[PDB]
């Protein structure tokens, strides 16, 4: 049982702007559509009935804990914009930890959506999707908001193909575990693979290194969500980028984007584009197609 006394008066505040009552929110808890370390996501009505997801945060039982994650996440209900998923609202009620609720994404992870095999995205395909992502995070970016976690696995797609840049603030978790590992300065799981080399030796995070990331991510969509660097131990990501490695040029990406994904790596983060830069570079390619 969370008690909102316990809680800061001005986080209770923020909350109850997105407050959902429980009689408005029908959970289905056999059907989960998501899973993460703070507990899985399942199908929900919202009432007029609404299609969405609901991710638990019953995992996260000390109070401190879902003080400080509310404290976080509770900006999301500031965002709006067409390639950032949205916040629905938050249930609070007599058991459990709040339950998030989020829109429903009809054609779940970008991860997925591209190494299923009856999709087989084309080039073009593939190169929208990217752009989608560049404007989601050029927002996010305007807003000061550093994602931290920036993967195709971390971005959604609803029933009209819109990218959503999701897996952050109150929708927050590890969805897929495999690519979290401790072997960091920080000890705990983090997505070293998608990390920029200053992030994994000073476990500091910007918006240059969300760059890093989307570079990363766009070798995802290219390869159609091949793992990127199977053949480097977690152990030896940091040295294998200080050598000046890189992920190599997926065989059905464009010269020009191979460019672009190179430039998100650079060693200095300063020298890296901006999001507006990338969303400027990626639509001229995307326009040739
Ligand atoms: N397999 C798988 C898989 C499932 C879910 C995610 C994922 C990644 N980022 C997120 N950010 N928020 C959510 C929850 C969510 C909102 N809407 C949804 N619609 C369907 C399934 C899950 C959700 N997610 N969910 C990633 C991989």
């Given at each position: 049982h969370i008690d909102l006394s316990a809680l800061n008066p001005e986080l209770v505040q923020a909350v109850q702007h997105v407050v959902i009552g429980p009689s408005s929110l029908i959970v289905h808890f056999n059907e989960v559509i998501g899973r993460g370390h703070f507990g899985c996501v399942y199908h929900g009505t919202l009432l007029k009935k609404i299609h969405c997801a609901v991710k638990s945060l019953n995992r996260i039982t000390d109070i401190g804990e879902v003080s400080q994650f509310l404290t976080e996440g509770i900006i999301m209900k500031d965002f709006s914009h067409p390639n950032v998923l949205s916040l629905l609202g938050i249930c609070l009620r007599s058991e459990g930890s709040p339950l998030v609720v989020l829109p429903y994404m009809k054609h779940g992870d970008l991860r997925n959506f591209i190494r299923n095999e009856t999709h087989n995205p084309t080039v073009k395909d593939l190169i929208g999707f990217?752009?989608?992502?560049?404007?989601?995070?050029?927002?996010?970016?305007?807003?000061?908001?550093?994602?931290?976690?920036?993967?195709?696995r971390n971005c959604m797609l609803d029933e009209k193909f819109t990218v959503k840049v999701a897996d952050f603030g109150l929708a927050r978790d590890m969805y897929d575990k495999e690519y979290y590992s401790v072997h960091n300065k920080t000890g705990a799981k983090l997505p070293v693979k998608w990390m920029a080399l200053e992030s994994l030796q000073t476990q500091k995070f910007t918006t240059k290194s969300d760059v890093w990331s989307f570079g990363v991510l766009l070798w995802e969509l290219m390869t159609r969500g091949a793992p990127p660097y199977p053949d480097?131990?977690?152990?030896?990501?940091?040295?294998?980028?200080?050598?000046?490695?890189?992920?190599?040029?997926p065989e059905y990406c464009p010269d020009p984007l191979y460019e672009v994904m190179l430039k998100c790596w650079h060693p200095k983060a300063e020298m890296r584009p901006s999001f507006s830069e990338l969303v400027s570079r990626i639509s001229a390619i995307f326009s040739t197609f």
């Open positions: 990217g752009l989608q992502v560049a404007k989601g995070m050029k927002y996010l970016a305007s807003k000061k908001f550093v994602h931290r976690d920036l993967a195709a480097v131990n977690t152990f030896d990501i940091t040295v294998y980028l200080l050598q000046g490695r890189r992920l190599l040029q």
